[PDB]
């Protein structure tokens, strides 16, 4: 099972994060990526319109660029080092 779980991750692919910059139309969303350049991208029926608001991180695929799911916010690798000072 330790290697079966690795198979399942391996035959999958990564996601590339964006956030909803501006709603354009029903099935078209404008995002500004965390890597930069803005796109227009689509949605599956794996997400709702009432479940998206702006500044909410969204997944995209790196082979079709379509949102499948809602993603929690991000927060610096740097600011986690500050919470580890308490001594």
């Amino acid at each position: 099972d330790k290697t079966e779980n690795d198979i399942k991750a391996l035959q999958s692919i990564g996601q590339l994060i964006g956030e909803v910059m501006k709603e354009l139309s029903e099935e078209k969303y404008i995002v500004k990526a965390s890597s930069g350049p803005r796109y227009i991208v689509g949605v599956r029926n794996s997400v709702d319109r009432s479940k998206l608001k702006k500044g909410v991180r969204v997944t995209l695929d790196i082979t079709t660029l379509t949102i499948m799911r809602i993603l929690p916010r991000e927060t610096d690798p740097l600011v986690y080092n500050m919470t580890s000072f308490e001594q």
Binding site: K8, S12, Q15, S34, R69
Partner: protein, 361 residues
């Protein structure tokens, strides 16, 4: 096998394992009952050195007790999945601070000025090794010991001699090199010089020349000394106690003790303050005899007579007498250093020709 990218873990957010009826994610999914529909396993977000972040289902083979929001990992380039964990990165200039079979110079290259040595051993070496007694005593560790006094006194040479002699790890670091105009990553040279050191502890960070990051000023106007001090403050951050300065130490040599920062006057930064004097009567004679140990000498010499005609010279000036004795011997056409030529090397080099034409003095 190769290739595989090197990355850091932004954060871990963790989705549920596949054992529920309603998704295996912490987030909510458009559409209900799903368990393998569009809901995925445990998750970590990592930042690639191709400069993006990728949200991946992390490999079940890599235990999630290995991931930290600040840890360096392998990622398979072709399809981005954590392959493995790897130790943390260090910058190339920081990897050569280490020893590589550093030679020792031990106390056999030092004659005269024993008191200095004693203070150094007590400050640095023994709180490392006798670190239990220190807790018994009920006091906090030293963050470093300062060395100061005029140029040529012997500071640098001590530092090397003792660190190699006792086998405490000697990091070779020079102050201006931390000042870089990459600042933020050049300030991260400072951060990594402590990062290496906390793994390589106990360790001695010998910073040679402490008047670049030991500047008096931190009120500067309309100049680029406001770039300079931002690598000074990061050092003072890693000498504030969130430990990682409790066995990680600092030696510092400085030639000017007039411009040291007020946040380095205070103890908790540099604690022990070692003065290096002008040598006494007896001490000068010992110093000469250490340089003369290596070379041939005649047995008609007397170091006390030589110490009369030297008036409170320090150690650089005395090295320049012992080598100049043997300059003269080659020049006459011998190879035996005459006992008379010490006398002529004192006058030949004082680090000054004559005392500058007298006409009313």
């Amino acid at each position: 096998q190769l290739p595989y990218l090197v990355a850091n873990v932004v954060e871990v957010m963790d989705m549920n394992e596949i054992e529920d009826k309603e998704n295996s994610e912490s987030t909510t999914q458009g559409g209900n009952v799903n368990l393998d529909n569009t809901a995925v396993g445990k998750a970590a977000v990592v930042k690639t050195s191709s400069r993006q972040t990728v949200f991946l289902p992390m490999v079940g083979l890599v235990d999630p007790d290995k991931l930290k929001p600040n840890d360096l990992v392998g990622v398979n380039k072709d399809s981005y999945l954590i392959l493995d964990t790897l130790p943390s990165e260090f910058d190339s200039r920081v990897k050569a601070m280490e020893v590589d079979e550093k030679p020792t110079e031990t106390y056999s290259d030092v004659g005269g000025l024993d008191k200095q040595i004693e203070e150094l051993v007590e400050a640095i070496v023994l709180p490392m090794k006798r670190a239990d007694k220190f807790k018994d005593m009920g006091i906090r560790a030293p963050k470093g010991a300062l060395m100061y006094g005029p140029p040529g006194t012997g500071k640098t040479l001590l530092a090397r001699a003792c660190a190699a002699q006792t086998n405490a790890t000697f990091l070779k670091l020079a102050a201006p090199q931390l000042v870089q105009m990459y600042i933020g990553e050049g300030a991260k040279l400072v951060r990594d010089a402590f990062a290496l050191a906390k793994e390589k502890a106990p360790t001695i960070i010998f910073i040679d020349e402490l008047d670049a990051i030991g500047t008096k000023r931190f009120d500067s106007e309309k100049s680029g000394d406001r770039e300079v001090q931002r690598t000074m403050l990061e050092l003072l951050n890693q000498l504030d106690g969130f430990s990682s300065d409790d066995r990680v130490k600092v030696l510092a040599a400085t030639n000017r003790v007039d411009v040291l920062d007020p946040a380095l006057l205070r103890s908790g930064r540099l604690d022990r303050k070692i003065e290096f004097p002008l040598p006494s009567e007896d001490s000068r004679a010992q110093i000469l005899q250490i340089h003369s140990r290596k070379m041939t000498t005649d047995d008609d010499i007397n170091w006390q007579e030589l110490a009369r005609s030297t008036d409170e010279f320090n150690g650089a000036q005395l090295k320049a007498v012992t080598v100049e004795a043997g300059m003269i011997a080659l020049r006459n056409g011998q190879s035996s250093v005459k006992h008379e030529d010490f006398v002529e090397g004192i006058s030949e080099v004082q680090a000054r020709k004559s005392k500058s034409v007298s006409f009313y003095a």
